[PDB]
Nucleic acid binder design. Structure first.
Ligand SMILES: Cc1cc(Nc2cc(C[NH+](C)C)cc(NC(=O)c3cccc(Nc4ccnc5ccccc45)c3)c2)nc(N)n1
Length: 543
DNA sequence: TGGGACTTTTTGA
DNA sequence: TTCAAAAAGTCCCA
């Protein structure tokens, strides 16, 4: 169930400026009403609007039809439309709507118990509101997913979520000049799976306002990051979008009387976006952050993709069969040529990597089972059956004892830069011990021809600075509260520079690394050094 | 006595 | 053949 404040906000957002005199026959649709949270509020608003202008309607239109007693019949016969796939919810909503008046004649309530995606809608609607389903994300049957692919190929493709299709339907059955307002998961704004949906929305309807709650738990005891979308098909010219992005992601929804109070408060920030200038990723930032990003973009000649080679870590397919504690006695059974140092994301800090506490048995270098039978029977064979269920093992590409994705050793066994894929801040570290890692850590190394221009020390100096932390967080995807996704498709697009401040920045980075490396270390001075480096970086970027 | 925070490996391309 | 994106379940403290 949607929170009541959100429902009231959406309903008012649509119907507040409706001219009931000009069009006393509005069609308002709840595609997924459930118990009818939106439709009851729509009924109340419509009843108040009609009673407020009942005598004007009587004077202009038929004098007998427009009476206060007839408002209930008119609303239930011509105005409210609801759809659902649950018959019990439909019956409950019908009973509530009938009891809103409190049997002389028959009142036909326009309620449909059907699949909204597969229904042949007879007419479009002036207003559409509600909350599309999200409980069923990947639980669709094979036939249903095939139908979605065949009939909704423009917004739904493989990894797309169900509610994407709903968006298309809401756009398709919206009357020209009508208004739609829904609360949905916010993931389609930034996820690569929703590029088709974003383009479909941008090229058809005018978006008016986006409420981005980010990681705030809008739905109690439900872990979905929600957003509110309002749009119209009116003949606007400029079509600027109000954006209300939350600031404090730990606020409580119930602690406010209305959503307007929360939006106008300091817990939210507002800025305008030109819809014509939207990219595919829908970067939504204020003017100051936009100027910061543009300055950094124009100042930097190179990007990480231009001067570096990036790769994902080892994917064994069964970590228990190949990862052991360095203290484990079974490592005495494995030749040290097959053992590689193994690190996790927690082992990666700024500028350096913690000492590896684990060893990976790089079984791809085991040639035959006869010579190393002890390794294959006493260590790796413990999970042989599970290792046999891997896709490449079943297809015959990889042997049962080999790593599913062992990548290339020579990529890992070199001086490189490693970073976690999900972190609250920029943590880029120079690896000095040829560490191997799982997919939770990404790595990259400088290209050979750019080694004279860029050094690992300078790269980790600029990347770990607060300047580049802000620069990356501007465009980075926020997967959860206080957690950003650090993936190559975003990390490698970071732009880097080099100028007269290069040598001093590199020296400061070297000092920080040297302090962090020694045993008798106090963090201390490092912070001071960092501050100085940041100054230079700002001096280099004109910020 | 509830209540959400995290890392391994599946899989499309 | 192999990359990399994203999907996917258990568990402990006040
Ligand atoms: C908070 C808390 C907690 C606990 N515990 C535990 C914990 C953990 C970790 N850390 C510490 C937190 C874990 C556990 N398990 C299991 O199985 C595991 C293991 C490993 C890994 C994993 N991963 C996964 C899976 C699936 N899916 C997903 C999704 C997203 C992400 C991730 C993921 C899991 C338990 N307890 C309480 N009380 N609380």
């Amino acid at each position: 169930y949607t929170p009541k404040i959100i429902v009231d906000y959406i309903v008012k957002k649509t119907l507040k400026n409706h001219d009931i005199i000009k069009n006393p026959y509005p069609r308002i649709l709840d595609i997924s009403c459930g118990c009818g949270n939106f439709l009851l509020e729509v009924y109340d608003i419509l009843y108040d609007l009609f009673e407020e202008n009942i005598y004007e309607l009587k004077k202009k239109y038929d004098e007998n039809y427009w009476t206060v007693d007839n408002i209930h019949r008119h609303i239930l016969n011509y105005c409210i439309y609801g759809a659902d796939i649950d018959e019990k919810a439909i019956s409950i909503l019908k009973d509530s709507l009938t009891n809103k008046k409190v049997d002389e004649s028959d009142i036909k309530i326009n309620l449909f118990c059907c699949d909204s995606l597969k229904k042949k809608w007879r007419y479009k609607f002036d207003y559409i509101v509600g909350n599309p389903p999200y409980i069923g994300h990947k639980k669709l049957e094979k036939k249903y997913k095939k139908f979605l692919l065949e009939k909704y190929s423009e917004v739904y493709k493989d990894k797309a979520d169900l509610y994407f299709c709903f968006y298309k339907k809401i756009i398709d059955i919206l009357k020209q000049g009508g208004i739609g307002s829904v609360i949905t998961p916010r993931y389609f704004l930034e996820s690569l799976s929703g590029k088709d949906l974003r383009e479909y929305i941008k090229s058809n309807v005018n978006v008016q306002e986006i409420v981005d709650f980010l990681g705030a738990n809008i739905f109690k005891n439900i872990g979905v990051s929600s957003c509110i979308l309002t749009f119209d098909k009116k003949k606007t010219k400029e079509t600027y979008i109000d954006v209300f992005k939350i600031k404090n992601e730990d606020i409580c929804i119930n602690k406010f009387e209305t959503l307007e109070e929360l939006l106008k408060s300091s817990k939210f920030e507002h800025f305008n976006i030109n819809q014509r200038l939207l990219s595919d990723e829908w970067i939504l930032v204020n003017k100051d952050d936009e100027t910061f990003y543009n300055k950094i973009q124009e100042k930097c000649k190179y990007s990480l993709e231009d001067i570096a080679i990036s790769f994902q870590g080892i994917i064994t397919g069964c970590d228990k069969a190949f990862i052991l504690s360095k203290d484990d006695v079974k490592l005495n059974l494995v030749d040290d040529k097959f053992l590689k140092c193994w690190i996790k994301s927690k082992n990666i800090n700024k500028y350096i990597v913690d000492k590896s506490e684990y060893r990976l048995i790089y079984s791809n270098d085991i040639d035959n089972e006869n010579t190393n039978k002890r390794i294959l029977d006493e260590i790796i064979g413990l999970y042989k059956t599970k290792l046999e269920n891997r896709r490449e093992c079943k297809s015959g590409i990889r042997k049962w004892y080999e790593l599913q994705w062992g990548r290339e050793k020579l990529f890992f066994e070199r001086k490189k830069i490693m970073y976690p894929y999900k972190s609250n801040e920029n943590r880029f570290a120079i690896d000095y011990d040829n560490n191997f890692s799982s997919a939770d850590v990404y790595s990259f190394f400088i290209k050979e021809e750019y080694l004279d221009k860029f050094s690992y020390e300078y790269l980790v100096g600029i990347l770990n600075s607060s300047v580049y932390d802000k620069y990356f967080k501007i465009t980075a995807k926020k997967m959860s509260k206080n957690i950003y996704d650090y993936y190559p498709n975003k990390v490698m697009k970071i732009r880097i520079f080099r100028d007269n401040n290069y040598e001093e920045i590199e020296n400061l980075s070297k000092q920080i690394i040297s302090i962090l490396l020694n045993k008798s270390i106090d963090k201390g001075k490092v912070e001071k050094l960092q501050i100085k480096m940041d100054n230079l970086i700002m001096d280099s970027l004109g910020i």
